[PDB]
Design a protein around this nucleic acid. Structure first.
Ligand code: ZN
Ligand code: ZN
Lengths: 114, 115
DNA sequence: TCTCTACGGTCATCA
DNA sequence: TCTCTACGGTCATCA
């Protein structure tokens, strides 16, 4: 009977992280580690990791969870990604947390100047 | 039988202009009047009239003719539009031939000022 | 917890 | 008679 990979104790996994993101991880351990397991909207991914629509729209590249748009159900569906997947890609894209910090610095100086 | 609308003589219409563009016009008159009947690629429409993909991709807004891409058949299909349709829209978009000329002037001073 | 495309302008590859 | 979207940024809509 397989144990949550963080706590090594629990056997009931979080249904979304298990089912959608293929992570053997319990709900509690997920709350106790947002550095890995927090879900981000598509807008957060663009803003916080400078990903783009081509990347995030790629189903072979990220798992995602769709929900109704909380602003109005007649709006485009919300999409949530799991931080570790995202943050792995961003780092590979930009060269670790350092390289990403630089990109953040770069676009920052861009708009100050504009 | 219905006669061409340019010459009023011929009864055989140009098959593409008739069939695709819904114009009762014959091959000869289409050659004698490119100001209306010449076909333009999608790239020509963008360059010469500052139309955009959303506009040109709209089937309700323009008729179009698709052919194999003459550069390579594995490339995206060529699309051709008829000048009068295009030039009507551009004029409505930019405010006659005058307003379009200005837009042409506008983007050209843009490129100069990008040294 | 929001999202998508529209707008400049353009090189590349199918490219 | 070449076409597409990829990139930087951002606002309006549904929007
Ligand atoms: Zn656990
Ligand atoms: Zn005729």
């Amino acid at each position: 009977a397989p144990k949550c990979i963080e706590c090594h104790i629990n056997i009931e996994m979080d249904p979304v992280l298990h089912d959608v993101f293929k992570l053997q991880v319990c709900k509690q351990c997920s709350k106790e580690h947002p550095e890995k397991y927090a879900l981000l909207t598509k807008t957060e991914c663009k803003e916080d990791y400078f990903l783009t629509d081509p990347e995030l729209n790629d189903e072979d590249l990220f798992h995602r969870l769709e929900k109704p748009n909380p602003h109005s159900g007649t709006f485009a569906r919300m999409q949530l990604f799991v931080r570790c997947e995202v943050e792995a890609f961003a780092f590979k894209k930009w060269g670790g947390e350092e390289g990403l910090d630089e990109e953040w610095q770069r676009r920052e100086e861009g708009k100050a100047h504009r």
